[PDB]
Amino acid sequence: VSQVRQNYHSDCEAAVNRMLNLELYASYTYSSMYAFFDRDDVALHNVAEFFKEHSHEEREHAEKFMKYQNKRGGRVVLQKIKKPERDEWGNTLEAMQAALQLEKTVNQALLDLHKLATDKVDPHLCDFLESEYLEEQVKDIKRIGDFITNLKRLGLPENGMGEYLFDKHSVK
């Protein structure tokens, strides 16, 4: 047992490692979206940069789980990062609907881990998840939800002018 380990159940250590992988998968999916919107036949650079920023955010979240593992005396165990669901993301509305889906998947995993930490009576892990993940997760979901509503208002996917205006004004 690690000399620093105290009140840190094996189940939670395994769950932290799975959560880290899921954060990396999300980061990679966001990188794919960045690359798509940067294509010459797509050309929505502000949208591309939005997704690049979220890729970086999700990578930072995974790195925080690595540091957390070590702080508690757990051991980081890495797995392969699966390639994203799609190679092409259709348009701004499809990609944002996919980001909403992804965010909710990550959120549900964090809520699952929080419930496990509550059940194992690990208040440090609960506090970490509340402070560093749950809040930002709700904020991100709301932001993307707001975007979806505006994209639909702007006539997406049919309305090319509306897609241009979104890139210029909602993610400028």
In the three-class reduction of DSSP (H, G, I as helix; E, B as strand; rest coil), residue 7 is classed as coil
Query: What count of Cα atoms within 13 Å lies in the side-chain half-sphere of residue 111?
Result: 8
3-class SS at 131? helix
Would you tell me the crossing angle of helices 135-153 and 45-71 to the nearest 10 degrees?
170
Return all residues near 53 (Cβ < 8 A) that are at least 6 apart.
none
Q: Confirm whether residue 58 is marked as ligand binding.
A: yes
Task: Give the binding-site size for Cl ion (rule: CB under 5 A).
Answer: 8
Q: List binders of Cl ion among 119-148 (CB under 5 A).
A: 135, 138-139
126 belongs to the binding site for its own copies (CB under 8 A): yes
Contact 134, 114 (CB under 8 A): yes
Could you tell me the sign of the dihedral formed by the alpha carbons of 152, 154, 156, 158, in that order? positive
Q: Which CB sits closer to its own copies, 11 or 164?
A: 164
Burial of 137 (0-12, 13-18, 19+ CB in 10 A): buried
57 to 76, contacts with its own copies by CB under 8 A?
Answer: 59, 63, 66-67, 69-73, 75-76
Among 7, 14, 60, 90, binds its own copies (CB under 8 A): 7
Q: Give the x/- contact pattern for Cl ion in 56-95, rule: CB under 5 A.
A: --------------------------------x-------
Q: Which of 14, 53, 60, 149 binds its own copies (CB under 8 A)?
A: 149
In whole angstroms, what separates CA 89 from the centre of its chain?
Answer: 17
Q: Is 140 annotated as a binding residue?
A: yes
Footprint of its own copies on residues 33-52 (CB under 8 A)? Answer: 34-36, 38-43, 45
Region binding Cl ion by CB under 5 A among candidate stretches 21-29, 113-121, 143-151, 156-164: 156-164
Is residue 158 part of the contact set for its own copies (CB under 8 A)? Answer: no
* Bind-site residues for Fe cation: 23, 58, 61, 103, 137, 140
